[PDB]
């Protein structure tokens, strides 16, 4: 039984590009604050450079027919080909639209594609159309079908520009085949259980320690270490980690024991990793390899490995629960457990050990949407204002 | 049938031409300039191993682009649907506006023409029209301009008049000589103006409300239109169109900035020929409308006041018309149309008018002559 895309689901729009005779999969992305424009995020080199799907996820809010859309404009449904769909950017909460402005990349007959505050008007709405003759108008849209998006405001296809030096997405009269990948379904998500993409705090066995990094002393090299700390840092933003699965499709599904994932620091953008000298050190997006940045949750420290498992195309079963489950962090390749150094604002260093301690359990607390939003705002703003300061200094 | 054609053309953008497919396009104006250079270049215009003997590729490119622009402008939705707020009509107009920039439409109109020239022997050297830039090419530009973008703002109207519309009128007025009148280019230019430019300025007449410190441009336009109206090669329909256009413009124009045309009027009406019918009606309408500007010392501040020189000129007009009319033989239509004019001028002129004993010296012999008007 092939699944059908329906409203209130979370998806990412993917387009394939042939660059220097190399097939590369790209995802449409946008960052709410700072740049209303939309760009492209690569997801082909996931093994070496982890993609950022948090700014690529979109929510299908409304799916209306063309006639009904026109009527309301004058005044969990399943998507069928030919309906008008409203896409909401999951992070920003703003809607994809034809900006009616042109960046003029040698194509005068084109418009820019970005994000918009209001839902009113015909710019936010897009029409889905079959990619081949196998599909037809009114037919249900499968999860694996390719799609063509047409702007209601301008009848301009959601287009991928090969001609320009750096790949861009715009609204042009040439058509581009977009593939919709289901990220998560909120309806089939169990409340209180760990799902992929959550921003969470790693609480220690005493519930008053959280895995953090040193506070801001203007030293990014000192901010690269990882330690246990207690106090107000548990409600501060530097204790926030985003769990990122290694899969692109169904990344918002429930997290099971043994599932590899990457832990990203929200306020610094650096992924947790194990160095070759058995030391935890944050490293950059470009270097954040699967070999170093892969971690799993074990129900017990007992050595029986989870073994080979299949990834399932769905939300999956709910195994890890917030605040009622004891988890042990294990590096996938080395098998080392995460534990405190126990040497004597505790500043108890977090280290990797073959056996660890008996009180090495980690509790899970899910952060609030407000906290995650503010943390990503802080990261983006500090990056931009550091670029500004460097330019002024030059 | 217009929207569907718009769908089809936007789905296949290669129908728009190499200048406008969207990738590596030089633009409509650049294409028209490349075409007029190709038309001059003989290596590219002809095969180089009339129209069938030599298909001028420059003219072919220009007529293709003019036909595309004309088709798009005709595909533009009607004004009333836009006023009613029909979303699809608004969408079509926005698509066409995105397709064709305003500057490209302005530039093609700004492009000049090939001036017909008499020769040392007296024979007119005819530049071949089928091989060069044609008035119909600009006429299509005008149709797109007034059907898609719309001329609804005054400084835009004035800028367009200054850049592209006025020089064409001046060229038409310069080809008013008998030898140059029979030239095909003069006929084509006259048709283009009387079909596209004059009706446009007639429908956008209310925009001529405030043109105080563009006085020179509006005076030049009036003079050129009056000379073109005096032109002889014009047809009956062309005369009617230019009469309506001039009357509509002068009616909305403020009475202060039309004394310069009054001078020509007050000399040319007393001849009481067939050509005088339009100017004497124009005087009738002017003096019936702006009667308070003369009899009342002040009027509104916006009208201004009499300078006593236009007052002397109007009194001279009244007396000249009256005397020419008195020694003129009876013609029914001519007197029935002249009487309202004489009555209006008499009413506008103050009854107690101070006739200045100091009469004006050094009359404008150029505006005041027997032959050539220069």
Swiss-Prot record, chain B:
The modification Phosphoserine is found at residue 370. It comes from the Eukaryota. Channel activity is modulated by phosphorylation. Phosphorylation is increased in failing heart, leading to calcium leaks and increased cytoplasmic Ca(2+) levels. Induction: By TGFB1. It is found in: Sarcoplasmic reticulum membrane. Detected in heart muscle (at protein level). Heart muscle, brain (cerebellum and hippocampus) and placenta. Signal peptide: none annotated. It is linked to Ventricular tachycardia, catecholaminergic polymorphic, 1, with or without atrial dysfunction and/or dilated cardiomyopathy: An arrhythmogenic disorder characterized by stress-induced, bidirectional ventricular tachycardia that may degenerate into cardiac arrest and cause sudden death. Patients present with recurrent syncope, seizures, or sudden death after physical activity or emotional stress. CPVT1 inheritance is autosomal dominant. Ventricular arrhythmias due to cardiac ryanodine receptor calcium release deficiency syndrome: An autosomal dominant arrhythmogenic disorder characterized by syncope, cardiac arrest and/or sudden unexpected death, often in association with physical exertion or acute emotional stress. Patients who survive manifest polymorphic ventricular tachycardia and ventricular fibrillation. Unlike typical catecholaminergic ventricular tachycardia, arrhythmias are not reproducible on exercise stress testing or adrenaline challenge. Belongs to the ryanodine receptor (TC 1.A.3.1) family. RYR2 subfamily. Cytosolic calcium-activated calcium channel that mediates the release of Ca(2+) from the sarcoplasmic reticulum into the cytosol and thereby plays a key role in triggering cardiac muscle contraction. Aberrant channel activation can lead to cardiac arrhythmia. In cardiac myocytes, calcium release is triggered by increased Ca(2+) cytosolic levels due to activation of the L-type calcium channel CACNA1C. The calcium channel activity is modulated by formation of heterotetramers with RYR3. Required for cellular calcium ion homeostasis. Required for embryonic heart development. Homotetramer. Can also form heterotetramers with RYR1 and RYR3. Interacts with FKBP1A and FKBP1B; these interactions may stabilize the channel in its closed state and prevent Ca(2+) leaks. Interacts with CALM and S100A1; these interactions regulate channel activity. Identified in a complex composed of RYR2, FKBP1B, PKA catalytic subunit, PRKAR2A, AKAP6, and the protein phosphatases PP2A and PP1. Interacts directly with FKBP1B, PKA, PP1 and PP2A. Interacts with SELENON. In cardiac muscles, identified in a complex, composed of FSD2, CMYA5 and RYR2. The calcium release channel activity resides in the C-terminal region while the remaining part of the protein resides in the cytoplasm. This is Ryanodine receptor 2. It comes from Homo sapiens (Human). The gene is RYR2.
